[PDB]
Amino acid sequence: KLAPGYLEPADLPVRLALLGAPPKPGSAALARDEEARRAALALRGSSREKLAATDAELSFPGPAKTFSCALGTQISEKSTPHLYTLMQRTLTDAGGSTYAGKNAYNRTRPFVVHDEGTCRKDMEPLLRTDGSWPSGHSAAGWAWGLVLAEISPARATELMTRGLAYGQSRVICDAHWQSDVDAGRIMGAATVASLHGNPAFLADLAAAKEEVKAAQQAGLKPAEDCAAEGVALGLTQ
């Protein structure tokens, strides 16, 4: 159910070297995670939580739909085949697929710690047994934001903001801690640096730039309710 990643395992960024240990028990860092959790759970029942629910969808075309409004055009196999492929393959590179248990911290997720629910009840049987470190959604979101921003520089701010919000959706969903979302962005940026050393990624990147240019010049607007996503995001950037 996973596309081949661009990167060989030996070329993946090394979590242990790049990341610090998770917040220790009794630490202010852990208190910051609980504070972020409490602030996030205040949004339970809101449109932002509902957007966090669709942000959790990693099965394509999930991510493609999620980033279309920020891109200004629809990401699809028909319109942007190379960009679509790039997002699928970089999900493997940046996401939870690389986060093995060996040489990794085991992270008990917030909703398990506090015996409460998430914004995606259907994904919980998987997440309960999952202690991935850091947040793979966060890493993929930031990686997607950084690559897409390079693909369409005229929408760089919208795309990078959307990629950051994608990681924040994991806190709002009560699926992972703030610190793991923050650490996810370190891995996401690092993975993008490695991808720029990969000729296969670079070829798809170059083709995606032409696809997006062609779609925007032809006036293809996103096939998503960008108004509703904007409201859910709050914007006021």
Report yes or no: 13 and 194 within 8 Å, Cβ to Cβ. yes
d(C-alpha 230, C-alpha 200), whole Å: 34
Per CB under 8 A, contacts with a second copy among 143-172 are: 145-147, 149-150, 153, 156-157, 160-161, 164
Residue with tokens 């093995």: 100
Which span (49-57, 89-97, 181-189, 223-231) binds a second copy, by CB under 8 A? 181-189
Shortest separation between residue 121's beta carbon and a second copy, angstroms: 28
Q: Is residue 77 involved in binding a second copy (CB under 8 A)? A: no
Our CB check for a second copy shows the closer of 68 and 178 to be 178
Our CB check for a second copy shows the closer of 31 and 214 to be 31
d(C-alpha 75, C-alpha 221), whole Å: 10
d(C-alpha 232, C-alpha 101), whole Å: 35
Exposed (0-12), middle (13-18) or buried (19+): which is 142, by Cβ within 10 Å? buried
Choose among 129, 136, 82: nearest CA to 108.
129
Which span (43-51, 58-66, 126-134, 190-198) binds a second copy, by CB under 8 A? 190-198
Exposed (0-12), middle (13-18) or buried (19+): which is 132, by Cβ within 10 Å? buried
Which span (27-35, 78-86, 92-100, 213-221) binds a second copy, by CB under 8 A? 27-35
Contacting residue, 92, 194, 223, 226, with a second copy by CB under 8 A: 194
Residue with tokens 């993929």: 140
Contacting residue, 16, 100, 203, 206, with a second copy by CB under 8 A: 16
Q: Is residue 103 involved in binding a second copy (CB under 8 A)? A: no
Contacting residue, 112, 119, 186, 212, with a second copy by CB under 8 A: 186
Per CB under 8 A, contacts with a second copy among 198-237 are: 236-237
Query: DSSP letters of 21-57?
Result: PPPPTT-HHHHHHHHHHHHHHTTTTSHHHHHHHHHT-
114 is catalytic: no
176 is catalytic: yes
Phi and psi at 59, nearest 5°, equal -65, 125
d(C-alpha 23, C-alpha 32), whole Å: 9
Positions marked active-site: 137, 170, 176, 180
Query: What are the residues binding a second copy (CB under 8 A)?
Result: 11, 13-14, 16-18, 27-29, 31-32, 34-35, 142, 145-147, 149-150, 153, 156-157, 160-161, 164, 182, 185-186, 188-190, 192-194, 196-197, 236-237
